[PDB]
């Protein structure tokens, strides 16, 4: 009896740790094409910077 | 002659003004997914005359 208790128990932990792990990953990414973004914006702003020499 | 000197002095302000007229439109112009934007070389550099306002 209390080895079917443990066995159920653990199984159903370590679904709850896989959706976490997936929801980890697609922030993560996420975060990645932000950070392209804001070297797309300083580029911008370093071509306006230079832009007034002339 | 007097008038003259007046003349083309005030002749070389309008062509420096509109001058700035175009560098300063085409800065507006500018915005982004731009062909020529890129990192430069010390943009926080300052100019070598720096006139103030």
Redesign the interface.
Known sequence: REMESFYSELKWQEKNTLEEIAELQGDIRRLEEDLRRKM?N????????????? | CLLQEIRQQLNSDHRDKMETLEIDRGCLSLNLTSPNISLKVNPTRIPKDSTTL
């Not at chain 1, 911008?44 to 020499?53: M, P």
Request: aromatic letters at 8%.
């Open positions: 797309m300083l580029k911008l702003a370093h071509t306006r910077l230079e832009s007034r020499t002339y």
